[model samples]
Target: PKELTQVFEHYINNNLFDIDSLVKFIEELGYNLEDLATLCLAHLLGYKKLEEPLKREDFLSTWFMQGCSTISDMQECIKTLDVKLHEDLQYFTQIYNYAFNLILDPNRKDIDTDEGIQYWKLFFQPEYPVRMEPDLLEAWFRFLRDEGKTTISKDTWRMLLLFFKRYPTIQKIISDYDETAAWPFIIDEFYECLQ
Candidate 1:
């Protein structure tokens, strides 16, 4: 913990570590730049806003209380987080959506839903309980862009990630998706495509 405090102190300016500095600190410690672990750490520390700075204590507590002082410790925490997400679908969706939407660029109005396909592919590969073909993901995105003729809304985009995570089979999504459930038109269309 003492050495960890020294690391936090090294990056602090005005007594707070901003996003870039925090990201740099994580990277220097051997974590991937955009790894979900980084986002999980930020969420755990109560850093709601992406552009804000965090005090040293807040930054340190995110890991220290979890027994994470080294890169391997943090990686273990990430594994635990993954299990936790699977354990509670509702809470997992809420956090997953919040973190996913939180990171999007606010200036961009037309959030390309297809841009997320690659990410979802990577995220789902390691832990998914069922086998799904690569082309299915591509086909799903293509249907959204070409057939649906819709731009991704933040709500719809986040829900798409959650949907992919929760449902291993297309049949589940097709049967469970309520037509009148107030989802965006694209989501309804996605269900329709599956049928």
Candidate 2:
């Protein structure tokens, strides 16, 4: 408890905690920087962006607020926090929004349908409370996999979240789905599967 800042100093490369130094520390704890778990940690760290460097004071407060001064204590606490992703849909959806930034290519406006499907499961896995029906998710994945369209538009990516929120158990779509809403043409075609 008394020597936590001393632990922090070992990870400090610049005047503050930079991403490189932060990553070195994370690597020591056996976490992948690119995975969803790390992103959850970043969110817990109160970062607006994953790349945002943290200040010493900010880092200390995040750990101290939980009464965890040892990095090992913080590690176990973070391990416990990861399960909330499946338990709380509202928060998962918030992280879902941030996930796009991490999942998408920095220069691209669209994600390749095949590539995007991986994230689909990460955000809405079978047991996740914040999930669409299995039938719907499987159908959507299958449609994207076989469709001629190769990429998912940024607009299309967001609309899936909208759709997930609007329907939970898939008992209300089909005839009720709006005929003129701005869903992508691919979606309209996919709706052919739904209809």
Candidate 3:
């Protein structure tokens, strides 16, 4: 892990790996900073959020068992990211949580809720967060139409994740939701709206 330590520290700016640092590092390691590959990289390294730079202990220790101690080894990890990294419910949920804060920044133009749905689509593609009966993406939008909500409150945004996680399939998701989980009005109406 010594070489990986060197590589990580090499990108540190003021004791943390900032976005510019990450961008340069990832590009050299052969992955696009704007791509899901970066998300997968963060997931592999046990990175928690986007705003804070990674902790030295956190990065090395989390990366310990991966058997990558050099940029070359890490590059290979990046190389087959589509199949090499295994993303579970936990990983998806972690990435999903980060999505809100990331999208909300700079672009918090107070836009429509569908802007978020676009990110949701990215998190669920090809498999993993897969096979949602009638597809929860479309289902949520349809619910919004029926209930008529153009904006997504923070609470509304959060509940969708929790409920959908607990109930990936439409049937179970529809039936298994908590009646009083501090859900928003839009979501409470969402129940009536979902077919």
Candidate 4:
């Protein structure tokens, strides 16, 4: 508890963390803007608005309540959260749907995936990517976001790696894709890209 207090104390200059200082504190923790963990913690601390300051008391209370008094504790919690996302498809789908909608910058066409690396870094954590080519997998994400498809349906999201593996290439995807399939229009367009 004392150690956590110290960590909190280290950041609580003038009793609050405005945007700049909060950025420094999170960066010190080896976190980044697009990190799901950062966004999760921010939401937990009631920081729905990025521009608002995080008061020291609010942050300290949340940290103590969550038992994340040190870097190791925080890391373990993050790992646990990752495992939960991997295990519960419904939970992951809901959180992911909410996260992209909430965190996507209106000014940007696609959400930044810099800190989002953690989402994919779990190595097919959702169980589908184990069968897809990594390059095609990468292309799938790029196509969706860059093409201005703002959100993903859970069905299509869950079916993506399967689509890639089953189709293997654009030619196969174009040939086999059914117009009436339940997949999102973005997926239909993705298949058509091979044409």
- The pairs that clash in candidate 3 are none
Tens digit of per-residue lDDT, candidate 1, span 74-189: 65776676566646556455566666555666676555555555445645553443245555566576786668554556677666665565555666666676778666677677
Give candidate 3 misplaced runs (Cα > 4 Å).
9-16, 34-37, 43-48, 55-61, 76-87, 98-115, 133-136, 142-155, 165-184, 191-195
Model 3 lDDT at residue 50 = 55
- Model 3: per-residue Cα lDDT over 1-195, one tens digit each: 568689887988887778778888888987776566677777676655555577778778766677778788777776666343235565566656655655564545333666666665665554655435446667876766556666665556666777665667667757767667676666667666666
Cα deviation of 53 in candidate 3 (Å)?
2.7
Model 2 lDDT, residue 181, Cα: 82
List runs of model 2 lying over 4 Å from the truth: 11-31, 48-58, 167-175, 182-185, 193-195
Provide the clashing-pair count of each candidate structure: 0, 0, 0, 0
How many collisions between residues are there in candidate 2? 0
**In candidate 1, which residue pairs get closer than 3 Å at backbone N, Cα or C atoms, i.e. clash?**
none
Question: For candidate 2, lDDT tens digit of each residue in 1-195?
Answer: 566787788888856788888788777767877656676778777776556688778888788888787778878876766677778777677777776665666568777887678778777777886656787787788777776668887778888888766765546667466647876676678777664
RMSD of each: 4.0, 3.6, 5.1, 5.5
Q: What is the C-alpha lDDT of each candidate?
A: 0.64, 0.73, 0.66, 0.60
List the lowest-lDDT window of 10 residues for candidate 1: 122-131
On TM-score, the stronger of 3 and 4 is: 3
**Who wins the lDDT comparison?**
2
Quick one: ranking by TM-score, best first? Answer: 2, 1, 3, 4
TM-score, cand. 3: 0.59
